Amino acid sequence: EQFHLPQPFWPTTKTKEGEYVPKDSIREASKVFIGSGVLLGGMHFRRLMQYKKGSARPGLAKYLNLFSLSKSQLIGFPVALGAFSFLSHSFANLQEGQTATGEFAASSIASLIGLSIFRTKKPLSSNVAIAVGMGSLFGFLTWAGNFNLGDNSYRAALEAGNGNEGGFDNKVIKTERQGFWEGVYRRPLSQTVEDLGEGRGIITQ
Amino acid sequence: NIFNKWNVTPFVWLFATVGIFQWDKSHRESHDGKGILDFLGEIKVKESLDTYFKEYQTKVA
Amino acid sequence: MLFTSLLLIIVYGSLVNKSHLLTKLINRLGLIIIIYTLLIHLNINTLENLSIGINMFNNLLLINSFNNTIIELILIICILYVLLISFNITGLSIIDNLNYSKRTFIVIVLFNIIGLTLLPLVNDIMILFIIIELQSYSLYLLTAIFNESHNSTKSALYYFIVGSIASFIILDATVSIYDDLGLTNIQYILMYIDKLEIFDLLCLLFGLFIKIGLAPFYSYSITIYSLSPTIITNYISLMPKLSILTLIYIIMHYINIVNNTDLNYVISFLILISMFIGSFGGLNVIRIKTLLAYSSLLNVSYMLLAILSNSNESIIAYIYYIIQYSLTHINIFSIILVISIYLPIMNNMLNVMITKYSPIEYINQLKNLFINNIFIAIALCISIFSLIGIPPLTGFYGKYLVLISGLNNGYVLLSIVLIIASSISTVYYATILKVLSFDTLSFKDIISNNLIINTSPENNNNEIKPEISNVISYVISSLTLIILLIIIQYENIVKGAYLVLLYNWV
Amino acid sequence: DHVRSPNVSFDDIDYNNSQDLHNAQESLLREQWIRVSALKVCRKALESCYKTSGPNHYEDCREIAEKYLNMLPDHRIQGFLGYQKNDPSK
Amino acid sequence: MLVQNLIIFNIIGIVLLVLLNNNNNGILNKKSLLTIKNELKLKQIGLIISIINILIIIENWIGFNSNYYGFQNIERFLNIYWGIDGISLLLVLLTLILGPIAILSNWKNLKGYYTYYVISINMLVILMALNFICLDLVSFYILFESTLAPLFLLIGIYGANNKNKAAYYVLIYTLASSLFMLLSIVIYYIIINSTDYIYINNIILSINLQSLLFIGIIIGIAVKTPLMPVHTWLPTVHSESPLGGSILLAGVILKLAIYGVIRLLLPNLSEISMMFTPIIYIISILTLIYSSLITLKQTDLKVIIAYSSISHLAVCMIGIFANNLIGINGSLILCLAHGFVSPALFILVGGILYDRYHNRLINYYQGLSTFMPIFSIYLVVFSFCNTGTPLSGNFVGEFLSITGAVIRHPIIGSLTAASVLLSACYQMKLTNRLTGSVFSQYLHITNDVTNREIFLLNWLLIPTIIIGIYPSFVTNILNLASSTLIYSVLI
Amino acid sequence: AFNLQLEKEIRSKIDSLPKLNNVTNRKLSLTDYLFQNAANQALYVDNEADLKELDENENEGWEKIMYVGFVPTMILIFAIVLFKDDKSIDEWAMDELLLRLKEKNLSDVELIDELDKLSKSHVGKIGASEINKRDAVIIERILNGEYDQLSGLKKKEL
């Protein structure tokens, strides 16, 4: 008998057992690592030409210095992004889906791998704190449902008839659990026992 | 002074409270239990209050 | 009315002699023109008749109830702006004569009002390009109206280049749509909404996002607003957003027909970045107009969340938010112009230079406003607390309605972020309030005979001479109480927003 | 005067009727307070029996003490939200 | 006949003070007569306004029926429905009572701008009082956060040396957290199209959605009680805000969180409140235990009082989340009792000692009973009231809250009994030091408690003793209203 | 009473002393704060600062307000909680239990006799107490009969 704990999790579309064709972690991660390296490397060489186009104009130099990346950054960034793509896909396959826990782990580990490259002249604990901060942000991103709930939103549920447009009726009791956005007047007592359990006032005193 | 401004005041409240208490006790025997403060008003009953509730819940719906 | 009266003003201004008095009286003529334009527009255009949507001029323009509301708002806000240049703001010649120096001030405004009103009505890609350039060019001229100012000309040069690139992107998007379909009318394009590249419309929105200072293109907007004069920044930082945001809502309304999820994510990505820059950007700044520029960016992001959702609640949220933000925008800049009379006069460390174009340029120049003018200080405090979102002010209901549309459409991440951004932005909002009042009890027993207002001569030592002119003080009083007392008429105003339809019908 | 409870059950009303729902909530609460009043009266019998019996309280008050301990777990205010929002039959 | 009269009279009162004081502000260089004696005639009018506000709720109290279930005095005003039940009636009376007390506390200890202070105090009292009589979530939130604007300026203008830091803390802590509560309110208006109290209480949402709504609401509540670990703003605000601001904050504002649990969590999120009850107890128990131990190491006199309020309200949160009538009634009794004793401790510390020596460090004070006997009498009596000694309303509230906690959870709810020892540890250590040993070598002999300060202490002590000895004055009103909040299915 | 000439006499005495920090029959009516002109008002204030400078914790201006408005208000609150005809839910339930005792056992002659002579003020004092009253049969019937109808409202079972 597991403990009865609250579940503050937004609705997500679930795939039944046998679904969720796994993602090729190596191929997906290699595309990000190669693509990032070419663009970051390509722009670095292009910015070098801008320096040679003119070096006696302070205005141009000021903006070029901001966009300039160090050699470690030019190496660290593709590796961190490549590691992020691999771990995010690898952890998703293990759980048969993408979760905030896996994204927190994928983001924090990949950031720490990258931080150890271009942030060498810093304490290790300093890089761990940033890696935890970076991983928590992307874990929050997945928990919130990425940029949009999509078909799990109330507007999508309202169009599908899973909303509360028809009102409520206490004389109709549904054995199955209601929708995420659906409200009811009266619920089965068995569902309350499932959510809370017997004990402190449910059924028994 | 033993009857100064500070000593007398606590005793005044006791005398006033007991005298009014006995007055309220006598006021209920001859008024079928109604208290001394019945002049201020009367407690509103459910029948009238529920009418406001019914109209209140009608506008909300 | 606008076009016909503009031509008369152009000829009349070039005929009469050059003087400050004639320019001010000509500015009042422009005020009458806009007032007459509002009366004519209200006489023929009604919300009920325009609900279906009526095509005009060979279907090049399409007016509906949603478009008509913004046009009425544009005319009204322009009336309040002309009052600044049509009347005294401080009563001092050394300060007020800047507004009366340029005769073409009222002419350029009338040019831009025509562009602002027609932009949401565009129904063809050809007229879309024409009108957006008509509005853009008028803004460049107004930014450069003070051609003797180094910063004004520099800002206009910056404004021209950034806007021209945005216009090229807009033109590039419309041309790409013509290549795919061969049609120029939007309604004809809607027939092929499921067969054209919907990301070409995202290219169109990218050009429009640049013109409203959205991130990552925020940098030029903050720089231009801070360098431009306060009388110019008050117009160019609000008016372009009135029309372009309305047009963006219409374009997003068409985009949602196919409901491209990838399109929403890209716009969500830009909204997320704009909330980060809008909140953290204003934390370490010393200029008041720089602070307001970050405030403008953050509030546009809030409106874009309603626009991105594009539902029935979004119409209510957007219409209310744009109206109340404009009134707050006018109120804040009106107070900033007036309170320049309380600036101390030197009679030095940091070698601070203040010019006649921007007498109020730093946040700490608002010190002791609680003592100098308690009623004006409270009016500013009410406006600032509205931007924060303190209920029951107009600002709270704007964010309350935006959150309703965002959460109804499933933008949980953006709704939580917008509330964290609101708390972060409250830090620099509260800094304005700290400067105004937090030193009142220590400076109450202070002597200030060196203020700018002290240089104003008295009439007869017996006349009760007000420190502020009748018109500008009344406008501040009216706008402040509307922001404060919106709870009295909030229910009816939203009912008016219920009737603003964008092809909803049933 | 002494107003009496408007006996109404959650099982014979429609919750969309706000007046009927209001009566069902009130009726359930008023019946629970009667049980508490009954419990206090029964406890008064136990207190009176214990004093007069002395060393005979175990025998003289045996049935009263048994009744008090059985009613105590449920002769208390339980509210109406539990029964209003739950159907025991399901 | 309540909200309409209360708002209109106070708005007229605000206008009346503004017209009189600001009439001659036109660089007249005038002297005038209203400003004589530190604007005495303007403070007096504002004090009369606060007294009349109390009479307004008393007229409606006469018609209140304690045997009627549901909201009474239902009224439509500003497109908002307003109503009163047993719980709301008592909290409104406490808020209005502290009105004149807060004004009288700063009668002649402000550097100036008394009219601004008086208007701000009366505005805060009415806004907080209106928050107990609103009948929807949106109206609840509007009044919940409307008090921030007058309070932010009040602290920043009339505050102590660190008033700037305190003003930022109260504005940002209480707004960033309340915005999470607004999200839950917005969700209610989206899926139910209404935020009415009665309407949302009858709707059962999914167990996952109730978890999300509870977290959003509890963040705003937990910061406002306050609970650990979001409590650090409160000691800073109390140590820097003016005495009248501290009285309102400690006596009314912190009670809005307990009332928020009654309205926003128990009747509408009943299923998830049962699940969250063990978590709430763990947080509140640690809040009670940690705050008492942290108080033992504080050196600021007013900070010690600030931490004492955190421990007591932890008991209130524990009692109000118990699913029985004993715990619920005890939590409400303790809130009323804390509403009188806590301001008195600030008055003794921040209003009597501070107004004479202007230093809040504890090292400067000892043996104050030698030349301030009247001060020490009230200090000792209120110290025992704060520790839960019987004959005081705090004991009735604490005992019933502890008893209700044990009934709700016999094992971990028993830990609430540690408040009896821990509260006496820090409160008496302060009182034992302030009265023991020889008179402080760093203090000059001066006046004892004056008549004005005697009045404040006596009329805060009287309600505490009356509630402590005969709490049936409070229980009778609460019994019918509080019985509706219990969720149980006994079969 | 403004008494403008009184300030003229007072001001002259203050002006007669060039040094500072080296009358009782004086008051102001409500019309003095609003109807007095600038010339008369300024004379009072200049005197007040100087007269106050020439100088415990009494006559602060709050005594009359609090002891006429606040203290009687607290008395009214005390009177309400004491002498108001309030029937709490527990008090109502006790009367209802005895009323249902009558309505269910109307054939018991002994029960009716005790209930009729059980006064309203003594209804809620059932049990051992100082009052000499007969309620043994009243308690006995309650011990034997369940007069609550909670099962009637719960028409659904597991």
Ligand SMILES: CCCCCCCCCCCCCCCCCC(=O)OC[C@H](COP(=O)(O)OCCN)OC(=O)CCCCCCCCCCCCCCCCC
């Ligand atoms: C590879 C191409 C370049 C990368 C794309 C950049 C453009 C898109 C980014 C949008 C924001 C535009 C900001 C302006 C462009 C940045 C230009 C730049 O790279 O300058 C670098 C700048 C200065 O860095 P500095 O270290 O001081 O100078 C280096 C000297 N060696 O360093 C900076 O400060 C720039 C960062 C600005 C802050 C942007 C933060 C956006 C929000 C991120 C967090 C999202 C918020 C929500 C988090 C939760 C989400 C779930």
Ligand SMILES: CCCCCCCCCCCCCCCCCC(=O)OC[C@H](COP(=O)(O)OCCN)OC(=O)CCCCCCCCCCCCCCCCC
């Ligand atoms: C119980 C109540 C709780 C209430 C508060 C809850 C939130 C708590 C947040 C905890 C995290 C912040 C506190 C710790 C940060 C300390 C920052 C710092 O120490 O320095 C800044 C750091 C660089 O370090 P440095 O400047 O060298 O300082 C010397 C350190 N030895 O700079 C850094 O490296 C930081 C990493 C770079 C910046 C990352 C920004 C990305 C976005 C961050 C989240 C923002 C989300 C905003 C959402 C709305 C806007 C979109």
Ligand SMILES: CCCCCCCCCCCC(=O)OC[C@H](COP(=O)(O)OCC[N+](C)(C)C)OC(=O)CCCCCCCCCCC
């Ligand atoms: C319940 C609805 C109430 C709403 C309206 C309240 C009045 C507004 C102020 C207008 C009059 C005025 O600015 O007058 C100023 C008054 C009078 O102060 P004074 O000392 O005489 O002024 C100094 C002049 N001296 C030095 C010459 C004497 O002080 C106030 O500012 C008090 C009221 C405002 C308190 C809260 C401010 C922030 C409000 C934010 C709202 C969300």
Ligand SMILES: CCCCCCCCCCCC(=O)OC[C@H](COP(=O)(O)OCC[N+](C)(C)C)OC(=O)CCCCCCCCCCC
């Ligand atoms: C979910 C519950 C939320 C509770 C509230 C959250 C924390 C509030 C912190 C108060 C800050 C304050 O007061 O701002 C004022 C402080 C001033 O700092 P200071 O005290 O003068 O010391 C520091 C100064 N020095 C070093 C010179 C002495 O500036 C700040 O810190 C600015 C950043 C504040 C951003 C807050 C955004 C919160 C986002 C929402 C939560 C994720």
